[PDB]
Design a protein around this ligand. Structure first.
Ligand SMILES: Nc1ncnc2c1ncn2[C@@H]1O[C@H](COP(=O)(O)O)[C@@H](O)[C@H]1O
Ligand SMILES: Nc1ncnc2c1ncn2[C@@H]1O[C@H](COP(=O)(O)O)[C@@H](O)[C@H]1O
Ligand SMILES: [Cl-]
Ligand code: NA
Ligand code: NA
Ligand code: NA
Ligand code: NA
Lengths: 312, 313
């Protein structure tokens, strides 16, 4: 089947060691638990959309190494097309090595790896899939130039663009904004992007407006527990969409659950209002927040209320 | 076809190595510039070196039923090591060593033993016929102490020479580890932990070695990085220093394991060399490993070494 949602972006393998204390320079320490997790903002977004029922295609680059083979199998296991998941001998699969002590303090070492080698030729080979999609989703864990090209290829075929500038970059190219039909980020990303302080939903509306003035059609800033705030060119007044309090268990990758869900709605429920989409998206993300383990916490359609999948 | 003359009961671990500009401070997320996966664990390293010199080896160990463990078995097989008693378990992940290295080669290392801790007495018992035909058993401390102790007893009772490497070392090690060791081999910092003494010299090491010898080892060897090693025996208790040639070290990681795996090779295949001789050859082989990167990848093959290392008494 033709994929409605195409995600051009990152896969990363989380390599997590639990220890009683963090090591000092020169020290070997014995930890008490290791585990592997599937991450990367692209793949996370793609998985959430897929689990809600989207036909997706993941365009990305991993290693020709075990991590990369295992990533491919995780995508397939989630019913994501891996036709343009490239494997390269030139770098390892992206990694995040995470050490956490008994106090919850951590050290993280990220090696973007093969994700940085995804390039223009790769995306051109994927032109069929990109052109026939309804939504293209991009972030900033691959080369910026590659994301920019993906956005451009989407615009030239009339595909809707959902851009998530995460992690944020202070001097982001002005074209990112003009190429973004929907531009979605969090509070600390907005601060980096605009130079402002965002300690309130009001402060966020002001940062959102700056971003909107740079040429995004729609700007959405996520606000953790506080839900999100939205503006558009047609409706420039910031509208706050709260989300009902829940007992958060692990909020890791909540933003990716949100974005993936938004991608799902944009592609499959185009006639919902934007306000409506963002409620459903907030809800789905809030579900992810109540279980551990990032992708493993992303709900499937069958475990969610049927109301999220009807009109009204 | 061929009987394994060297049996190694011990650890496999997957090395997960991130190169960075600086080591991360508490709470910090940093970006590194390179990631490598490697095959480690003191047992497997020892075994690989012996195998590459020509020994028929058998690796007794436990890894996960996971990708790391399937990859580890393929590494062993690729090095011509028997994996008949390399067990795989659903109950834990393959052991890991998560390593961050900065531009200066300083590091932080987090080891998670994982499946290596589940190697148990039933697993060893199945290996009894192999142990009984071996010439040398090699153990370390990266599996359960009790499992290593049982491997050493199973070796003794079959008349198989025991080569014990108490690494990582621990204060107040069971007295039986010494009495069950025909050859007991460790480095300077291990010797300090084991004896409570300070070893900042080859002379200091001889004194630590003597303590260790008094606890009942037949032969004690302490490795001394660039200084080579020092040896004592019950029959010859005077410490003998064996130096080794200044070479330009590129990466000394796993050099000790190269040294031990070579020694294991000699004990098994050249039993009539003098001990002094064995330790020159071993020093040399370990010194070659130090001139290339990547632990097992730096361990030389017999065909790439001077033919003089393979001649008899
Ligand atoms: N503590 C929380 N309680 C309920 N929902 C949350 C919480 N944190 C995040 N979310 C949801 O997931 C998204 C992730 O937002 P952020 O925390 O800005 O990455 C939010 O916009 C909410 O929809
Ligand atoms: N810089 C070096 N030059 C030559 N040989 C070395 C060097 N570092 C380690 N080795 C060899 O590997 C053994 C193990 O060293 P150590 O890690 O100190 O136990 C030594 O006994 C030497 O045979
Ligand atoms: Cl400790
Ligand atoms: Na985010
Ligand atoms: Na979660
Ligand atoms: Na050692
Ligand atoms: Na080396």
């Amino acid at each position: 089947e033709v994929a409605a949602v195409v995600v051009v972006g990152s896969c990363m393998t989380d390599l997590v060691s639990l220890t009683s204390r963090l090591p000092k320079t020169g020290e070997t320490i014995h930890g008490h638990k290791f585990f592997i997790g599937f991450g990367g903002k692209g793949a996370n977004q793609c998985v959430q959309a897929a689990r809600l029922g989207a036909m997706t295609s993941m365009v990305c680059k991993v290693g020709k190494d075990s991590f990369g083979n295992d990533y491919i199998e995780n995508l397939k296991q989630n019913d994501i097309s891996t036709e343009f998941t490239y494997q390269t001998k030139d770098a390892a699969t992206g990694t995040a090595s995470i050490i956490v002590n008994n106090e919850g303090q951590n050290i993280i070492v990220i090696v973007a790896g093969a994700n940085l080698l995804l390039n223009t030729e790769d995306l051109r080979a994927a032109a069929n899939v990109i052109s026939r999609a309804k939504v293209m989703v991009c972030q900033l864990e691959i080369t910026p130039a590659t994301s920019l090209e993906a956005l451009t290829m989407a615009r030239r075929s009339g595909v809707k663009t959902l851009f998530n500038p995460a992690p944020a970059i202070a001097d982001l190219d002005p074209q990112f904004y003009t190429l973004s039909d929907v531009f979605c980020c969090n509070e600390s990303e907005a601060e980096i992007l605009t130079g402002l302080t965002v300690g309130s939903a009001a402060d966020a509306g002001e940062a959102a407006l700056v971003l909107l003035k740079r040429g995004c059609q729609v700007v959405i800033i996520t606000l953790g527990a506080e839900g999100c705030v939205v503006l558009s060119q047609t409706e420039p007044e910031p509208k706050h969409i709260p989300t009902e309090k829940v007992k958060a268990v692990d909020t890791t990758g909540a933003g990716d659950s949100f974005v993936g869900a938004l991608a799902f709605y944009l592609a499959y429920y185009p006639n919902l209002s934007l306000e409506d989409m963002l409620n459903r998206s907030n809800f789905i993300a809030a579900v992810s927040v109540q279980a551990a383990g990032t992708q493993s916490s992303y709900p499937y359609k069958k475990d969610l209320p049927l109301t999220l999948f009807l009109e009204h």
